[PDB]
Design a binder for this molecule. Structure first.
Ligand SMILES: [Mg+2]
Ligand SMILES: [Mg+2]
Ligand SMILES: [Mg+2]
Ligand SMILES: [Mg+2]
Ligand SMILES: [Mg+2]
Ligand SMILES: [Mg+2]
Ligand SMILES: [Mg+2]
Ligand SMILES: [Mg+2]
Ligand SMILES: [Mg+2]
Ligand SMILES: [Mg+2]
Ligand SMILES: [Mg+2]
Ligand SMILES: [Mg+2]
Ligand SMILES: [Mg+2]
Ligand SMILES: [Mg+2]
Ligand SMILES: [Mg+2]
Ligand SMILES: [Mg+2]
Ligand SMILES: [Mg+2]
Ligand SMILES: [Mg+2]
Ligand SMILES: [Mg+2]
Ligand SMILES: [Mg+2]
Ligand SMILES: [Mg+2]
Ligand SMILES: [Mg+2]
Ligand SMILES: [Mg+2]
Ligand SMILES: [Mg+2]
Ligand SMILES: [Mg+2]
Ligand SMILES: [Mg+2]
Ligand SMILES: [Mg+2]
Lengths: 60, 144, 185, 67
RNA sequence: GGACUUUUACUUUGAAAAAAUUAGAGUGUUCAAAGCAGGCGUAUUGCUCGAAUAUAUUAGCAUGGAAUAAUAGAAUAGGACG
RNA sequence: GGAUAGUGGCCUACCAUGGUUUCAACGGGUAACGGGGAAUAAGGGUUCGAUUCCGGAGAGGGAGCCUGAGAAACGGCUACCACAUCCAAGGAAGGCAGCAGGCGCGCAAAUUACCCAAUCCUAAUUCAGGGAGGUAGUGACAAUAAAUAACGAUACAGGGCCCAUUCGGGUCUUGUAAUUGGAAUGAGUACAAUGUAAAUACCUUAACGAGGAACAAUUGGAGGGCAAGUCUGGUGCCAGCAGCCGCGGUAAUUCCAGCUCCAAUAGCGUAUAUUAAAGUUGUUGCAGUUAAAAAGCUCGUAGUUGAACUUUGGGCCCGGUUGGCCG
């Protein structure tokens, strides 16, 4: 069907969303030590057990 | 025993029959006839480079409503005109008419992607510096 | 126009993509043996797979088949020599069994821990990879060396390095430079 | 460290049984170092396009300086 | 050495069988991919294991099998023997 | 007969009328050199091989030939066709599908470097020559190993546990730390020798070389399939996402982002193909009443197929390999 519609609005949403810049953070380990932080975090010390186990909850 | 011959000599009838009924096997057909080279905008190659003609905004299909930004591209090696899509938000701003772009397929063996009727190819590299890099802000568009 | 320096890869790769059970199991194995790549687990799983296969193959043969006997007991003595196959269960029937942890538990960075010298599989990793420890005076820096059995009796520290006496190093003696330049002349 | 070594019965029996790059490395025969490979090649290829001793053509191309 | 022999299919076993690849043995290239090395003593005059095995299917060959499948024979006896 | 090195319709005279074919001749296509092989792992299969080894064919296209033991050779010649260079306009010369290297073409591919030291070759030949071949440069082609951190003290919190009448923090540490602790090491830098034809790097090794401004990991994903949020801000059927099902028209679990998190990790994504999935090519092993699919019917040639029956049974000997209970 129509092929010649408007084009002006091209790149609208990105170009109008407030550029909020990142926040400086602790350098996470790069490699085995990361797999270790993952091991202890996932399993060793454990976290919540509210029914089951949540891997990324916000205001839960 | 319905159908196929079972004798110890029927080898011929069997392999022949296999050829025959292989011809209904789509993929086989296309691979054999060589639709690959005769038809198809690209040579059979993964991608192909062409030149930008019109900048078209195609109204998407149903049940959907939008304006899919695209580019009329005439393949260099081919001269075949073919209309492709410029992915990501923005990007149509990056391309401009009379430009030299690298085109790739839309992963479906031909067949237009989603709500975009006709368009069977997406864009990858304007003026030789990759859409993504620009749309982020790594590289910057070449001089001319 | 020369000769083709041949090669082959060492790791297979799991056919299912995102299975939490397997992924967690893998993770635990990594976090326990001090691994960085799931590839370190894959590699082993593949070794295990080719062995197990050779086993099945030789079993389908006839009992006391020449090939079965020769090759079978060759694989077997190969497997016991590095402390993987149980000297008790020792007629391929158990290599059909076996598992990954058998191989895992026999690596250099594992042995370096299972007998002191570590208190941490990670301490094992770091130390080993840092030119410490050896077999003879032959330094080794491969976290997966796989300690051969009757050489377990040679995993000390290095004739180089501290912990085995040779020189404190460069950081320590830089502190000695700090002392010999501070508290006096 | 691990390498290889040999010992020749006289001093004359090494200077004629050894690669003279080894004699070079030791301190026996100095390297008569020369024009590059491409250079020498090029010189032979020039020299090919001349039949005879040369002086005849140097002087016949010296007669060429006249007319 | 002389004299004649119904033709097959299948199967068995062997010969003829480039290397690399492959499968697989051996040797701790620091490990691994690899490489085909190496190992030892009297390390001032020298001792020594190696560098396998497998596959190589159709056809040609050579050998054993005689089930399963065909083929040929003696009725206008122009049969079989001696 | 002729010709060849030689057999032969190889060629020529005369004579005959034969030769292949549905068991697929002949013709057409091949984005076709053949093989050893390669990719995919239940098996059977499917797919691919221009490319390090073997065999063949060419040296821009055709033919022609000299020399020679060997060539219908092309870094040999001759002619023609197509290219194309030099000129003083009379004339003369070139053949990179050798090594580099240049244009072109493209999605797509590296230095106009060093050497005979090795592996081997040729000559008259121990030496000379060898862009064969080797060295380095270029090089996330594919492949192997695998740094980006290890360990204390300590500020409360704790779960363990002896006791609990009721102070609890004690010594077994799970560790979350917004204070600290001395330790270690190659990534790089760089004497030395080693390496090498010479150099380069590697293995070795003096003097250097880690505290968050690093010597600072990436590439995608977080509705589903599918592993990880129903957090906050933006947009409002717009911009965009989405392989597929689907999301966006003001509280978007999908878009633009921030935070957090997942998967893989010096690698991850995308496009094209192909294999597995695929018992959706079905010999193994598909389906066909109504979903795709039994010719309206019977004859019948090739083809595949085709009942049963002919030395069955009894008796004796020899000599091998495992295994039993003795050793
Ligand atoms: Mg049809
Ligand atoms: Mg739909
Ligand atoms: Mg064209
Ligand atoms: Mg050191
Ligand atoms: Mg071709
Ligand atoms: Mg082919
Ligand atoms: Mg080939
Ligand atoms: Mg080609
Ligand atoms: Mg020629
Ligand atoms: Mg040439
Ligand atoms: Mg030639
Ligand atoms: Mg003139
Ligand atoms: Mg060239
Ligand atoms: Mg490339
Ligand atoms: Mg020479
Ligand atoms: Mg480089
Ligand atoms: Mg870094
Ligand atoms: Mg990210
Ligand atoms: Mg989920
Ligand atoms: Mg929101
Ligand atoms: Mg988001
Ligand atoms: Mg079906
Ligand atoms: Mg129907
Ligand atoms: Mg019917
Ligand atoms: Mg009919
Ligand atoms: Mg029958
Ligand atoms: Mg009998």
């Amino acid at each position: 069907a129509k092929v010649h519609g408007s084009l002006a609005r091209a790149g609208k949403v990105k170009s109008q969303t407030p550029k909020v810049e990142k926040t400086e953070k602790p350098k996470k380990p790069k490699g085995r030590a990361y797999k270790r932080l993952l091991y202890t975090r996932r399993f060793v010390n454990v976290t919540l057990v509210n029914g089951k186990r949540r891997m990324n909850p916000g205001p839960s | 025993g319905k159908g196929k011959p079972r004798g110890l000599n029927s080898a011929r009838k069997l392999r022949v029959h296999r050829r025959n009924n292989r011809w209904a096997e789509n993929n086989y057909k296309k691979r054999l006839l060589g639709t690959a080279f005769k038809s198809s905008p690209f040579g059979g190659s993964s991608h192909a480079k062409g030149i930008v003609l019109e900048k078209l905004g195609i109204e998407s299909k149903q049940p959907n409503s939008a304006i899919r930004k695209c580019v009329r591209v005439q393949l260099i090696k081919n001269g075949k005109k073919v209309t492709a899509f410029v992915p990501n938000d923005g990007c149509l701003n990056f391309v401009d008419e009379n430009d030299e772009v690298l085109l790739a397929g839309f992963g479906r063996k031909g067949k237009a992607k989603g709500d975009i009727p006709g368009v069977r190819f997406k864009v990858v590299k304007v003026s030789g510096v990759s859409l993504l890099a620009l749309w982020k802000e790594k590289k910057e568009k070449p001089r001319s | 126009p020369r000769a083709p320096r041949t090669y082959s890869k060492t790791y297979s790769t799991p056919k299912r993509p995102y299975e939490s059970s397997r992924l967690d199991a893998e993770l635990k194995l990594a976090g326990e043996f001090g691994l960085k790549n799931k590839k370190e687990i894959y590699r082993i799983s593949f070794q295990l797979s080719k062995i197990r296969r050779a086993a099945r193959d030789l079993l389908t043969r006839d009992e006391k088949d020449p090939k079965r006997l020769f090759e079978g007991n060759a694989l077997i003595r190969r497997l016991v020599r590095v402390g993987v196959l149980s000297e008790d269960k020792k007629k391929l029937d158990y290599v059909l069994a076996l598992k990954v942890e058998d191989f895992l538990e026999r690596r250099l960075q594992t042995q370096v821990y299972k007998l002191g010298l570590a208190k941490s599989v990670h301490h094992a990793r770091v130390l080993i990879t840092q030119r410490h420890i050896a077999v003879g005076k032959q330094i080794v820096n491969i976290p997966s060396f796989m300690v051969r059995l009757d050489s377990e009796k040679h995993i000390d520290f290095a004739p180089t390095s501290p912990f085995g006496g040779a020189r404190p190093g460069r950081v320590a003696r830089r502190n000695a430079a700090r002392k010999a330049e501070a508290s006096g002349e | 460290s691990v390498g290889f070594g040999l010992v020749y019965n006289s001093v004359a029996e090494a200077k004629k049984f050894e690669p003279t790059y080894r004699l070079v490395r030791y301190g026996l025969a100095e390297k008569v170092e020369k024009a590059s490979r491409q250079q020498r090649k090029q010189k032979k290829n020039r020299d090919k396009k001349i039949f005879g001793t040369g002086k005849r053509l140097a002087k016949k191309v010296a007669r060429r300086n006249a007319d």
